[PDB]
């Protein structure tokens, strides 16, 4: 009507072309460098801390704050290039049914009675990106929310699955987890924990037990299966009470003896 | 009809030349990632 | 529109080329032979009057 | 850009596998105006 600009017309293989072309920018790299950038902040942050120093927790529950605002970013990004191509598979299907305009079908569209897809239209009525069917759940994010507790003792029960307060009640009577394993007295140099047998071995003595056996019962108590060398990954949590660990028993050995030879 | 032979001969050799370049893009998907392990050698080499 | 100002500017030659056709025809319709057969019928009616 | 350039020439190969199709759609159109034709053309040369 009036001016003869038409509000949409069918899709032209030359637009075809830049249709083709248009892409939603990629953050896939970006993401990863931030990714790497974090996990490498929060390693270096686990032994920064002065082991006297300490009130940790609050740095701990900043950085745990800024990795889930991460994941929430990197999850609706996902969002953002799925809602793209869905959308512009859409928008080809319409051009694709609409006809095309050759003698008097510009015409039709000109004055209103005929409609086309309009991408722009589209694109305003898609619907906002929703967190939906993600979980953050990292291993970066699991040794970050356990690592105050590592600080303020090597041995720790977190998981409260049975119950909220502790393992039963106020009492955990869950003993305590040794560095130096009894097969092995060296500290564990590779941590390797089945997601089984959830429990942690060197690996160096475990490698001699699953020889000639294609699978063995787990040494350690409260549990009964058998596993093998494929069902063994590194465990972080191990390595890091060692270092914690090793640090404030040289740091308790250094304060000791200054203050004996202080008496002197 | 022409037309539909040389359009449908274009179209054989521009997915001959997708076959070849995917082929062409996984070496080079493989090139970029040893060259990612050799910069995370490099830079480990220049940190100590 | 690029195709679309094209296939009206071929639509227009085409009605150019018809009208142009038309007006050939209207000239031909006069100056016939038998318009040159007439004017002297008028003429022998002329020789002999009422 | 490679991966890009490549994902928009498939696309492109599609798309002129469709226009072939458009275009073997509009030929079978016209070998239908051809049969009517030739059916005429007999029906003319049966009173020739």
Same mark, same amino acid.
């Not at chain 1, 039709?108 to 009525?125: C, D, F, V, W």
């Given at each position: ?9 069918? +899709? ?58 991460? !994941? ?33 079908? #510009?015409?039709?569209? *000109? ?39 590592? #600080?303020? /003792? ?5 998981? /409260? +699955? ?39 071995? /060197? ?36 390595? +890091? ?12 050995? /250094? ?10 | 009809?022409?037309?539909? *032979? ?39 080499? &220049?940190?100590? | ?28 319709? *006069? ?6 057969? #007439? ?12 | ?6 994902? !928009? ?34 029906? &003319?040369?049966?009173?020739?």
């Amino acid at each position: 009507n009036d001016n003869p600009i038409p509000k949409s017309v069918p +899709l032209h293989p030359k637009s075809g072309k830049y249709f083709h072309n248009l892409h939603a920018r990629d953050l896939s790299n970006i993401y990863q460098q931030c990714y790497k950038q974090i996990d490498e902040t929060i390693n270096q942050l686990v032994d920064s801390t002065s082991p006297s120093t300490i009130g940790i927790e609050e740095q701990v529950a900043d950085i745990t704050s800024t990795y889930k605002l991460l !994941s929430t970013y990197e999850s609706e990004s996902n969002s953002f290039d799925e809602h793209i191509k869905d959308l512009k598979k859409n928008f080809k299907q319409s051009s694709d049914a609409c006809p095309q305009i050759d003698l008097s079908t #510009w015409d039709k569209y *000109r004055t209103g009675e005929l409609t086309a897809p309009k991408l722009s239209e589209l694109y305003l009525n898609m619907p906002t990106p929703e967190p939906a069917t993600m979980v953050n759940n990292t291993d970066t994010l699991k040794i970050l929310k356990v690592l105050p507790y590592i #600080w303020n /003792d090597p041995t720790c029960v977190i998981p /409260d +699955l049975q119950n909220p307060a502790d393992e039963d009640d106020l009492q955990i009577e869950g003993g305590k987890i040794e560095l130096t394993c009894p097969i092995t007295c060296k500290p564990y140099e590779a941590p390797l924990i089945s997601r089984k047998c959830n429990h942690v071995f /060197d690996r160096d003595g475990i490698q001699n037990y699953l020889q000639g056996y294609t699978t063995r019962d787990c040494p350690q108590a409260a549990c009964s299966q058998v596993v093998s060398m494929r069902d063994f990954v590194r465990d972080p949590i191990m390595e +890091l009470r060692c270092k914690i660990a090793k640090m404030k028993e040289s740091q308790e050995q /250094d304060k000791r003896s200054s203050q004996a030879i202080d008496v002197l | 009809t022409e037309k539909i *032979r040389n359009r449908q001969e274009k179209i054989e050799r521009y997915t001959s030349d997708g076959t070849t370049i995917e082929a062409q893009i996984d070496a080079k998907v493989i090139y970029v990632n040893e060259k990612d392990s050799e910069h995370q050698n490099a830079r480990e080499l &220049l940190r100590d | 529109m690029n195709d679309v100002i094209g296939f009206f500017n071929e639509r227009e030659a085409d009605l150019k080329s018809q009208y142009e056709d038309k007006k050939k025809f209207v000239k031909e319709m *006069r100056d016939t032979p038998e318009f040159q057969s #007439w004017m002297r019928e008028i003429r022998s009616y002329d020789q002999d009057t009422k | 850009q490679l991966k890009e350039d490549i994902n !928009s020439r498939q696309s492109k190969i599609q798309k002129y596998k469709d226009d072939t199709i458009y275009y073997e759609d509009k030929k079978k159109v016209y070998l239908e105006n051809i049969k009517k034709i030739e059916v005429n053309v007999a029906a &003319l040369k049966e009173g020739i």
